[PDB]
Amino acid sequence: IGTYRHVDRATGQVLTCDKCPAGTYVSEHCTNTSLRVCSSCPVGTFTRHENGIEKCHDCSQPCPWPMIEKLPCAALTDRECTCPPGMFQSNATCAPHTVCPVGWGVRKKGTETEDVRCKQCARGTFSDVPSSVMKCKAYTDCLSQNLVVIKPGTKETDNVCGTL
Amino acid sequence: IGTYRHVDRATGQVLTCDKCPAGTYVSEHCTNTSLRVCSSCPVGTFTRHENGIEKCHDCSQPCPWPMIEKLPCAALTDRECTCPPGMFQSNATCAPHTVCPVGWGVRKKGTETEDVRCKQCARGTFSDVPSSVMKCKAYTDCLSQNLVVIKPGTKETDNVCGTL
């Protein structure tokens, strides 16, 4: 563990103290005859690193709804806000992901910062449900089924399998 | 930040959650539609690493006097006990460092785990004070003083400088 220089008030000696680990701060510095003392950051404050500071940093304002915490205000961390799942940030705040219509699917999964990206189902695939998440699904393999295609599929439906 | 697998109670789905940073634990696991939630370890408990556990570890018993804390019980750390300064651990507990008598000095500085190690002042050095800390000091250089040695030194005293 690291260390820091401190000027001792009574003696004006420059001491070398041990740092305090993250999530704590130095509640009394070392002197010529005792070690420094660490205390945990009180609720509402944080330190990210091993430090020698005398007060913990203050946690940012609470997350504006509809936003939510992906990290909390804790000893070692500032709170960190994100759009909840199924939403994504645009400008001001959060908007819900695109819902890919029947006949399309997700090409690029949506994130907390990018919307979802849809593409029309390519031939041989189809998608039968609106969803901001599902990929186009391959048709059922009628061949490797010991069967044949009774009805062809479409971008919206599987092909239907059987015989005669 | 890392992640862990969790089996969702209602659905028996195996989810992938984000881990919680050190000093927090997971107060509610992620589900198919919400992110996991971290809480800071309550006073008296700790987590050393980014984890996915549901309760923080318990902090060890307080330090037996004469011993003192070199790290505290905090979110990210277990308390860690040491002999106070000027003492060192032997067997049971703590004993004070050897005090090097006049005419000796410290060869090896004492630690919280090793005693101090003394050697008789070598010729040209001396030490005039009992101390569990000070090294043998070189005599004053009478030559580079524009002066001469009126009295020789000893292992206990400097030489005394002047003229005639």
Curated annotation (Swiss-Prot), chains A, B:
GO terms for biological process: adaptive immune response; apoptotic process; axonal fasciculation; B cell apoptotic process; cellular response to tumor necrosis factor; humoral immune response; myelination; negative regulation of B cell proliferation. Detected in fetal spinal cord and in brain neurons, with higher levels in brain from Alzheimer disease patients (at protein level). Highly expressed in heart, brain, placenta, pancreas, lymph node, thymus and prostate. Detected at lower levels in lung, skeletal muscle, kidney, testis, uterus, small intestine, colon, spleen, bone marrow and fetal liver. Very low levels were found in adult liver and peripheral blood leukocytes. This is Tumor necrosis factor receptor superfamily member 21. It comes from Homo sapiens (Human). Induction: Up-regulated by TNF. GO terms for cellular component: plasma membrane. Its main location: membrane. Glycans are attached at residues 32, 91. Changing residue 91 to Q: Abolishes one glycosylation site and reduces total N-glycosylation. Associates with TRADD. Interacts with NGFR. Interacts with CASP8. TNFR-Cys repeats lie at residues 1-38, 40-81, 83-117, 120-161. Disulfide bonds join 17-30, 20-38, 41-56, 59-73, 63-81, 83-94, 100-118, 121-136, 142-161. The keyword Lipoprotein applies. Keywords: Adaptive immunity, Apoptosis, Cell membrane, Disulfide bond, Glycoprotein, Host-virus interaction, Immunity, Lipoprotein, Membrane, Oxidation, Palmitate, Receptor, Repeat, Signal, Transmembrane, Transmembrane helix. Oxidized in response to reactive oxygen species (ROS), leading to endocytosis. Promotes apoptosis, possibly via a pathway that involves the activation of NF-kappa-B. Can also promote apoptosis mediated by BAX and by the release of cytochrome c from the mitochondria into the cytoplasm. Trophic-factor deprivation triggers the cleavage of surface APP by beta-secretase to release sAPP-beta which is further cleaved to release an N-terminal fragment of APP (N-APP). Negatively regulates oligodendrocyte survival, maturation and myelination. It comes from the Eukaryota. Coiled coil: none annotated. It is found in: Cell membrane. The keyword Repeat applies.
